[PDB]
C-alpha cells in the first residue's frame, strides 16, 4: 500500500502511552535506574489514574499552544528508496487481499460442525491460535466463517481462540507493483523541566521496544532503527527555557499498488489447416 | 484555547493552559455551550458528559 509512518506512530503511541501511564508499577519498573526523587516526583505528577498532570501527543506546526509541561512532538522526516524488484513486481495474487487482522472468537456447534465466526470475509487464514488440524478434521473456510468437524472434538464445543487472518477485497488477479523505502520520523519529548524530559525519553524508548512486536510493524515498517540527539533548549527566550531530547525512528517499508489484470484465458483450442503450396 | 474532550477529561476535568479569570465565549460543533453545562474549579474545566 501507500503508507504514512507519521500517522501510524501517532495512532500507535497514544494508546500505549495512556496504558503505561495508568499503570504505576510499569513506570516504577521503567524508571528503576533514575534518582529516587526524580522517579517519585514523576510518578506522583503524571502517573496513575489520579494524575493531575497529563502528557500529550501531536504533530508539529499546530496553530494553538501546547502542554509544554510534557508533550511528544511527532515530526515527519526524510526517506529514500533502497531496494527494487525485477520488473518492480513486489508480489502477485489470485485474490485481492486486505490488511492482516487478529480477532478473538469462540467455537460453536452447528450441524455437527464446530465453527468460528469472524467479523469480515476471510481472504486467507494464517493461524487458528493453539490448534493444528489433521486431515481428518476436515478444516474448511467459507465466507467469513471457519468450520471444523465436531465428531471427535465435542470437548471443545465452547473453545476460545484467536484467529489471525486477512481480509479479501475481491476475486481478481493482479500484480503488486512497487518498491521499498527507508524513511525517518523524529520524536521529541518537550518539557520545561529537564528531569521530565529525561523521563519522557525513557518512557518513549520503552514504548518503541514494546512496539517492535506489534503486527503493524512486523508485517510493514520493518527494521526499526533508533538514533538519539543531545538534550538542548528548544526555545530559549521565554520566561523559561523549553528542553527536549530528539530521537529519530527509521523504518524500512514497501510502497506499492494493486495493478489488476483483466485479461483471463480459460480455454486453448487447436486447429489444423492444410498447406497445398 | 481549544481542547478535544474525551472520557478521561470528562471524569478528571481539562487542566487549562491559562489562568482563566473569566470566559467570554465558549462553543462546540453543536453550538454555544450554556452556563449550566460547564464549570471551572481550581483552573480545571468540567463539562457535561
Amino acid at each position: 500500500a501507500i503508507t504514512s509512518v507519521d500517522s501510524y506512530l501517532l495512532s500507535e503511541i497514544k494508546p500505549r502511552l495512556n496504558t503505561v501511564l495508568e499503570n504505576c508499577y510499569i513506570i516504577d519498573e521503567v524508571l528503576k535506574d533514575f534518582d529516587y526523587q526524580t522517579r517519585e516526583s514523576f510518578k506522583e505528577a503524571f502517573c496513575g489514574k489520579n494524575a493531575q498532570h497529563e502528557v500529550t501527543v501531536g504533530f508539529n506546526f499546530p496553530k494553538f499552544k501546547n502542554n509544554y509541561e510534557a508533550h511528544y512532538l511527532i515530526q515527519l522526516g526524510q526517506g529514500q528508496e533502497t531496494k527494487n524488484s525485477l520488473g518492480s513486481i513486489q508480489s502477485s495474487y489470485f485474490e485481492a487481499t486486505g490488511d492482516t487482522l487478529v480477532e478473538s472468537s469462540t467455537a460453536i456447534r452447528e450441524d455437527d460442525k464446530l465453527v468460528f465466526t469472524v467479523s469480515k470475509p476471510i481472504g486467507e487464514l494464517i493461524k487458528v491460535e493453539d490448534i493444528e488440524f489433521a486431515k481428518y478434521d476436515n478444516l474448511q473456510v467459507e465466507g467469513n466463517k471457519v468450520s471444523f468437524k465436531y465428531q471427535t472434538n465435542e470437548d471443545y464445543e465452547n473453545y476460545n481462540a484467536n484467529i489471525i487472518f486477512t481480509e479479501k477485497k475481491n476475486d481478481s488477479k493482479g500484480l503488486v507493483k512497487g518498491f521499498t523505502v527507508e524513511e525517518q520520523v523524529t520524536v521529541v519529548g518537550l518539557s520545561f523541566n529537564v528531569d521530565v524530559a529525561r523521563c519522557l525519553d525513557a518512557v518513549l524508548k520503552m514504548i518503541l521496544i514494546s512496539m517492535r512486536d506489534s503486527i503493524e510493524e512486523q508485517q510493514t515498517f520493518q527494521l526499526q532503527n533508533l538514533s538519539f540527539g543531545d538534550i538542548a533548549p528548544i526555545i530559549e527566550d521565554g520566561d523559561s527555557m523549553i528542553f527536549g531530547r530528539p530521537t529519530i525512528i527509521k523504518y524500512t517499508s514497501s510502497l506499492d499498488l494493486d495493478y489488476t489484470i483483466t485479461q483471463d484465458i480459460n480455454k486453448l483450442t487447436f486447429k489444423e489447416r492444410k498447406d497445398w503450396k | 484555547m481549544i481542547y478535544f474532550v474525551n472520557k478521561d477529561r470528562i471524569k478528571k476535568g481539562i487542566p487549562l493552559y491559562y489562568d482563566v479569570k473569566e470566559i467570554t465565549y465558549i462553543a462546540t460543533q453543536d453550538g454555544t455551550v450554556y452556563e449550566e453545562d460547564y464549570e471551572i474549579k481550581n483552573n480545571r474545566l468540567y463539562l457535561n458528559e
Binding site: Y68, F192, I235, G238, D239, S240, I242 | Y17, Y18, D19
Partner: peptide, 12 residues
Amino acid sequence: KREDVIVLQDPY
C-alpha cells in the same frame, strides 16, 4: 518579560 511559558495562580 511576560509569564507565558510557566503560568501560576494569582496570589489571592
